[PDB]
Amino acid sequence: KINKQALIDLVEQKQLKAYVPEFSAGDEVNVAIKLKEKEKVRIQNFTGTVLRRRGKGISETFIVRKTTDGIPIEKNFQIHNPNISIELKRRGKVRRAYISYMRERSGKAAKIKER
Amino acid sequence: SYINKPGKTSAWRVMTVRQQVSAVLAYGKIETTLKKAKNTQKRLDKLITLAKVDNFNNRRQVKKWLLNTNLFDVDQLMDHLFSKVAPKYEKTPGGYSRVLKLGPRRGDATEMAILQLTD
């Protein structure tokens, strides 16, 4: 007769990963993507950082931005998405938990990383 | 349209709420619209909890919204409150104020209700 709507988390506790280290939108990562031709799943690496982290609980989707052949690809990955394995390369600096200026910032520079 | 009174703008209403939360500290009684009093009660309880924290940083936070009157200077008023009334009501889970609906105003049916403090 009395509900909780925290049992929503109880049923969500079946679709989660338990490997991803803590990240704060600016730690550079390399997410490997399992993609098929028809079979023999190949690896598509996607090196970048979290431009925007949006959602609620399981809905926490995060942007990852890469540049290939001068083309900027920004793609909204999910933390617990199958075949979306995130490898954390390094950690930068967190001015704020969200960034809206990587589009106005160019490459060729050593991005700041914590020592 | 063009030039007229602002009415109930957010800045206007927040300033008026600040005036009422200063006056309730000044005199201990407020007689106003019940619609204003019900919203004032929320921030009054929040400020009561903040006073119960009773920190110098809390002094800075409370300083932001208090206003000065003729007889109650801010330095005297806030120090007095934090000295005695901050722990006075420290044994109650909310409901730090109550509104009693009085008779309305004489002229234009302006509902007068009294907001006061309670345990």
Partner: protein, 229 residues
């Protein structure tokens, strides 16, 4: 058809992951374990239906007509009672489970009430076009334009009955069919489904057999991440 029906309430709305790597939004509906109030048939009561009761209450939380019939029915008091037409399988004084009415992957529909939002504009209730903004807009610039259907004597000179003029839009009886039954939970008596659900958290939910695809069933599995740390 021998309609299978259950009563539940929406308790949230989110997404989930699946096997075969597709995104699957989740409307989560807690289905109440219902006790049947009775059965009517078209040959005995002239309308085939099953009366169900839910939202159990105490002896002092109901009007004495309904409560008195309900204790005469030998059923512990409940807030709400509703009949489902063409349903006769479930008879009075028995428990209703979500695992027998339907199966994991077949297609159903849900009768529900929309969310209360009051009056909405004609451009929203009927999806018309707004007037001009540039080249001079004037004060009235949002309307459907002309209402005249003819000038002069005996052309139209009026607006007949039954016109789609804006009014109360929302909080209305709706039903969307062919939505996937994503997940079952008999331990919690709960259902995860796909799509978008009308109404707020508290809107009535009546699950029934889909008219477009009653028996069509599709396979799908959830995604359980086995990626070790």
């Amino acid at each position: 058809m021998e309609i299978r029906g259950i009563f539940g309430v929406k308790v949230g709305m989110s997404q989930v992951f699946t096997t075969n790597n597709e995104r699957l939004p989740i409307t989560v509906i807690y289905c109440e374990p219902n006790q049947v109030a009775g059965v009517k048939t078209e040959a005995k009561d002239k309308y085939s239906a099953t009366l169900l009761s839910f939202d159990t209450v105490e002896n002092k939380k109901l009007n004495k007509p309904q409560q008195g019939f309900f204790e005469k029915n030998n059923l512990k008091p409940t807030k709400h009672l509703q009949e489902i037409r063409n349903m006769t399988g479930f008879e009075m004084g028995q428990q209703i489970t979500p695992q027998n009415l339907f199966q994991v992957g077949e297609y159903v529909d849900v009768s529900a009430i929309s969310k209360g939002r009051g009056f909405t504009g004609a451009i929203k209730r009927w999806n018309f076009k707004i007037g001009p903004l540039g080249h001079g807009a004037g004060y009235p610039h949002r309307f459907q334009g002309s209402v005249q259907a003819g000038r002069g004597g005996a052309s139209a000179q009026r607006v007949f009955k039954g016109k789609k003029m804006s009014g109360h839009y929302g909080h209305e009886k709706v039903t969307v069919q062919n939505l996937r039954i994503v997940g079952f939970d008999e331990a919690n008596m709960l259902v995860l489904v796909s799509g978008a659900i009308a109404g707020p958290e508290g809107g009535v939910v009546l699950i029934r057999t889909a008219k477009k695809k009653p028996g069509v069933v599709k396979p799908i599995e959830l995604a359980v991440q086995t990626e070790k740390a």
